[PDB]
């Protein structure tokens, strides 16, 4: 029989029962409506020259500064794959939308806006802090995501202006930032800079809300470890300076403890929604799984509130305060017509160690090692990278688990005749590089098969690899060799798949994700993303 998520949950509950409903959850029924796949990327099968024309403006138009798309009077004025569209997410506080040349990737903005403006109780956003890129300390979001969020909150304020109660809005980012350039001694100044940026972000939001409104907005940063010279809180065998920092890496937009957007997307517009997009995936799902996401948020916010090295501030009732929103209720209440759509079984898995919870609290790695070790037919993987270069050049591999590593599980799968198909970012992907070529991964697996219980002679092992392992890297069209992917995706037996933040390559960052178990949903995901991507990926023969 094929992989059942129930088996994953049973294994975790047997081995880590103290983290049930903390870093994983009993599978529950949730609902996927049309549009639930938020896969953003260039148009597979074309070319970057063609796709990038989608952002060209004719002389009499211009590129909008808020959304970085061309203005627009009808479809004829839009190039590439774009069309003329007046999305609701361009609607500013005075109600006026803009005509822009939009592209399919903007579906993610549609999903964020639509989810936020419907809030009746709470909006809960967890992300990673934008990267430097010279332009001074941005926080929470960049590019079109910022305007989208602002416009959504404006609309939310109008939609709730006669509400009985206030809406809790939480924005939390994992912060890298003392560490980027010099470093571990300077934490005080860094807090000061973060405080300024966060205050300006909140002030900008407040300036597009009515003077009196029912939104209680908190912004904050979290980092759980800055040690560099010693362990952050884990059971790793590997040791490396770059593993000895930690902040949140999970990515969540959770409305009313009901509607969750989660996946690999940071809220960084230039990386996904402009020229030369990075490939990435999130999903939009509704149901009790939101509870688990809410719990994840609560764990981090509790940590921020009872250890404020970190920083936060909230604006409510016309005032800045340090009222800290540590807890949104995780109890699930089905909205009306919640059962609309495709019903699927889903469990959560998280990684909350390295200074937030106890060092044993990494159940995400265990669940994926189990999934790969128990695949019966196939494993499909799409990642940015599978290995990560340590501080002085050491290759760091996916982390050790009571059940071994991902690489050991994949070696077991290959020996047993399970098909393993892998898509990596390109080696020449700049900031989003795979770090290591296909040959490296092939030889790492070869060496795993030389040792361990297998003891295979090298040439004999190559027959297993050559029959069952196929490693490609992402390409828009099978020709370009510098395209980029940020996926954290895997699919077992065309049945069970992961969407979240957790890269296969190692780090100490906290992570959140979900495991869906359903053939119809997996088939939609493969039709929409995996098959096109695979057909256009490039294979470097060994």
End-to-end CA distance of the chain: give it in Å, rounded. 33
327: helix, strand or coil: coil
CB of 466 to a second copy, least distance (A): 19
Q: What is the DSSP letter of 426?
A: -
Residues followed by a break in the chain (C to N exceeding 2.5 Å) are 308
Does an H or E element contain 254, and which? strand 252-255
Q: How many residues does the chain have?
A: 542
Can you tell me the distance from the alpha carbon of 247 to that of 258, in angstroms, rounded to the nearest whole number? 26
CA distances from 120 to 117, 158, 309, 464 (A): 9, 12, 33, 55
**Residue 180 in the binding site for a second copy (CB under 8 A):** yes
Binding mask 8-47 for a second copy (x = CB under 8 A): ----------------------------------------
HSE of 244, CA atoms in CB hemisphere, 13 A:
13
- Binders in 431-470 for a second copy, by CB under 8 A: 431, 437, 440
Can you tell me the distance from the alpha carbon of 192 to that of 313, in angstroms, rounded to the nearest whole number? 13
Distance of CA 496 to the CA centre of its chain: 18
Stretch that binds a second copy, among 122-130, 172-180, 326-334, 486-494 (CB under 8 A): 172-180
**Residue 136 in the binding site for a second copy (CB under 8 A):** no
Residue among 308 and 437 whose Cβ is closer to a second copy: 437
Q: Please, which residues have CB within 8 angstroms of residue 337's CB and are 6 or more apart in sequence?
A: none
Tokens of 318: 């016309």
**Partner interacting with residue 454 (select from a second copy, Na ion, none; CB below 5-8 Å by kind):** none
Can you tell me the distance from the alpha carbon of 150 to that of 66, in angstroms, rounded to the nearest whole number? 11
* Spatial contact of 491 and 480, defined as CB atoms under 8 Å apart: no
Place of tokens 């160690």: 353
**Residue 240 in the binding site for a second copy (CB under 8 A):** yes
Stretch that binds a second copy, among 174-182, 196-204, 349-357, 463-471 (CB under 8 A): 174-182
Residue among 288 and 355 whose Cβ is closer to Na ion: 355
Binding mask 303-342 for a second copy (x = CB under 8 A): ----------------------------------------
**Residue 394 in the binding site for a second copy (CB under 8 A):** yes
Binding mask 496-515 for Na ion (x = CB under 5 A): ----x-xx---x-x-x-x--
> Applying CB under 5 A, what is the total number of residues that bind Na ion?
54
**Residue 92 in the binding site for a second copy (CB under 8 A):** no
* Spatial contact of 173 and 129, defined as CB atoms under 8 Å apart: yes
**Residue 228 in the binding site for a second copy (CB under 8 A):** yes
List residues near a second copy by CB under 8 A: 131-132, 176, 178-185, 228-231, 238-242, 244-245, 389-394, 427-428, 430-431, 437, 440, 482
List residues near Na ion by CB under 5 A: 39-42, 55, 69-70, 101, 103, 105-106, 120, 124, 126, 170, 172, 222, 224, 236-238, 247-249, 251, 253, 261, 272-273, 277, 279, 281, 297, 349, 362, 364-365, 367-368, 382, 399-400, 423, 474, 485, 487-488, 500, 502-503, 507, 509, 511, 513
């Amino acid at each position: 029989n094929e992989l059942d998520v129930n088996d994953i949950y049973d294994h975790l509950n047997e081995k880590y029962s103290q983290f049930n409903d903390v870093t994983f959850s009993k599978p529950s029924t949730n609902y996927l409506k049309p549009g639930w796949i938020l896969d953003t990327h260039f148009t597979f099968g074309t070319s970057s020259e063609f796709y990038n024309k989608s952002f060209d403006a004719l002389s009499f138009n211009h590129v909008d500064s808020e959304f970085n798309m061309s203005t627009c009077n009808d479809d004829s004025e839009c190039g590439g794959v774009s069309t003329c569209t007046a999305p609701a997410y361009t609607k500013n506080k005075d109600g006026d939308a803009k005509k822009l040349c939009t592209v399919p990737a903007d579906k993610i903005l549609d999903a964020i806006y639509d989810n936020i403006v419907s809030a009746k109780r709470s909006v809960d956003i967890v992300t990673l802090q934008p990267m430097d890129i010279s332009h001074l300390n941005l926080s929470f979001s960049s590019g079109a995501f910022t305007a989208t969020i602002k416009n959504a909150l404006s609309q939310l304020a109008k939609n709730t202006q006669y509400s009985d109660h206030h809406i809790t809005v939480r924005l939390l980012q994992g912060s890298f930032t003392p560490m980027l350039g010099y470093d571990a001694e300077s934490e005080e100044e860094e807090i000061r800079q973060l405080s300024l940026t966060q205050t300006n972000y909140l002030s900008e939001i407040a300036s597009v809300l009515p003077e009196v409104n029912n939104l209680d907005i908190t912004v904050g940063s979290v980092r759980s470890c800055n040690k560099l010279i010693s362990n952050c809180g884990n059971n790793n065998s590997q040791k490396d300076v770059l593993l000895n920092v930690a902040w949140n890496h999970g990515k969540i937009i959770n409305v009313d403890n009901q509607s969750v957007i989660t996946g690999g997307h940071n809220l960084w517009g230039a990386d996904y929604l402009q020229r030369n997009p990075v490939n990435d995936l999130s999903i939009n799902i509704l149901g009790p799984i939101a509870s688990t996401a809410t719990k994840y948020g609560n764990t981090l916010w509790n940590y921020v509130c009872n250890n404020t090295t970190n920083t936060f501030v909230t604006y409510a009732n016309g005032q800045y305060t340090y009222d800290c929103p540590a807890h949104i209720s995780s109890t699930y209440v089905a909205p009306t017509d919640a059962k609309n759509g495709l019903a699927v079984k889903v469990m959560s898995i998280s990684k909350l160690n390295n200074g937030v919870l106890d060092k044993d609290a990494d159940q995400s790695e265990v669940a994926r090692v189990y999934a790969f070790k128990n695949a019966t037919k196939s494993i499909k993987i799409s990642q940015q990278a599978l290995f990560f270069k340590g501080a002085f050049g050491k290759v760091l591999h996916p982390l050790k688990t009571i059940d071994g590593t991902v690489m050991e599980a994949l070696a077991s799968a290959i020996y047993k005749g399970v098909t393993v198909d892998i898509v990596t970012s390109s080696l020449d992907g700049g900031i989003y590089s795979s770090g290591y070529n296909s040959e490296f991964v092939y030889n790492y697996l070869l060496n795993v098969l030389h040792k361990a219980p297998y003891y295979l002679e090298r040439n004999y092992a190559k027959t297993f690899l050559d029959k069952n392992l196929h490693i490609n890297f992402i390409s828009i069209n099978g020709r370009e060799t510098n395209n980029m992917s940020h996926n954290k995706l895997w699919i077992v037996d065309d049945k069970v798949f992961y969407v979240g933040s957790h890269n296969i390559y190692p780090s100490s960052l906290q992570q959140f994700g979900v495991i869906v178990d359903d053939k119809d949903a997996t088939a939609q995901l493969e039709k929409q993303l995996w098959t096109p991507m695979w057909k256009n990926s490039i294979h470097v023969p060994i």
